[PDB]
Ligand binder design. Structure first.
Ligand SMILES: Cc1nc2ccccc2nc1CCc1nc(N2CCCC2)nn1C
Ligand SMILES: [Mg+2]
Ligand SMILES: [Zn+2]
Length: 313
């Protein structure tokens, strides 16, 4: 009750910044997450015993893949923490509770393969969930863990509040399907520009939270250049394994997943920053002005990938 989580001075200061790296010490990541819930939500949002037990079951259900692992989960939650803290008054008590949990859970039991590979492999999950295959699985795994004995961190919520928070978590996790991001951001762009965007419209909040989820999920592009560059190695280690698996099924993979096209990585990053990252943090800064450091940091890393192409590294 009177038990605050504190972090060492350097972490206590740097964790407030968008570009914070959670570091290589796995055993501190739960403490980091709790610290963020307490400062973002309150020391009263969750029974500590239940929260800790939930965090550790979530961790257990992330796999040892190069990118879509437990570190990704806590990184994506830290980004969401930075957004919520720099936009204090714009979000309900239920959204603050729900979104940090949604981010921790958003890639639960990921196998390091895209929805496309599941569908071409004919994985059982692809028959159970025809679109956003993995993302419906991730939400499904969230509900599973919430229903384990001693794991209901939402037990104090009313029947209807409980249903509202599970519906926030569901939409938030479905929105991490990048196939959905393009349309979602186009609509938000138009709505902001015609001045029709209304944060009292529940379907408008949904879209805005959806863009935040893309923002947090892509936040590897908003870090210091050495974090960004080294994370890219993990990302491509997954994609190239998937490319290998595509070739095993007798399918030429897309270039992004072909390890034979290593040399084109710098150009592929450019495309991605221009087609996805920049547009994402642009629209997000327009709708939420205090998230501008994500756009600024994204542009800095784009400039770093241009430097790689020019042979300056
Ligand atoms: C999908 C994706 N998500 C990321 C999320 C966060 C940080 C970096 C990310 N990088 C990518 C990969 C971008 C990409 N690479 C290539 N290649 C085509 C030939 C060689 C490389 N094409 N594209 C689109
Ligand atoms: Mg995902
Ligand atoms: Zn993710």
């Amino acid at each position: 009750g009177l038990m605050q989580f504190t972090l060492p001075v350097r972490l206590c200061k740097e964790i407030e910044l968008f570009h914070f790296d959670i570091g290589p010490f796995e055993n501190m990541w739960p403490g980091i997450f709790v610290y963020m819930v307490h400062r973002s939500c309150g020391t009263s949002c969750f029974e500590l015993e239940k929260l800790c037990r939930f965090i550790m079951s979530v961790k257990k259900n992330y796999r040892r893949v190069p990118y879509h692992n437990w570190k990704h989960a806590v990184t994506v939650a830290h980004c969401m923490y930075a957004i919520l803290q720099n936009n204090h008054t714009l979000f309900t008590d239920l959204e603050r509770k729900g979104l940090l949990i949604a981010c921790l859970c958003h890639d639960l039991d990921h196998r390091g393969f895209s929805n496309s590979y599941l569908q071409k492999f004919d994985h059982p999950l692809a028959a159970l969930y025809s679109t956003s295959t993995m993302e419906q699985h991730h939400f499904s795994q969230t509900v599973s863990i919430l229903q384990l004995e001693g794991h209901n961190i939402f037990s104090t919520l009313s029947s209807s509040e409980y249903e509202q928070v599970l519906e926030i978590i569901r939409k938030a996790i479905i929105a991490t399907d990048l196939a959905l991001y393009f349309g979602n951001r186009k609509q938000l762009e138009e709505m902001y520009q015609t001045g029709s965007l209304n944060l009292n419209n529940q379907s408008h909040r949904d879209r805005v939270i959806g863009l935040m989820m893309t923002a947090c999920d892509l936040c590897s592009v908003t870090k210091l250049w050495p974090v960004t560059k080294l994370t890219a190695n993990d990302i491509y280690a997954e994609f190239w394994a998937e490319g290998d698996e595509m070739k095993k099924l007798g399918i030429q993979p897309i270039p992004m997943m072909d390890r034979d096209k290593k040399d084109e990585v710098p150009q592929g990053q450019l495309g991605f920053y221009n087609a996805v990252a920049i547009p994402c943090y642009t629209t997000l800064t327009q709708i939420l002005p205090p998230t501008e450091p994500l756009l600024k940091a994204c542009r800095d890393n784009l400039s770093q990938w241009e430097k790689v192409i020019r042979g300056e590294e």
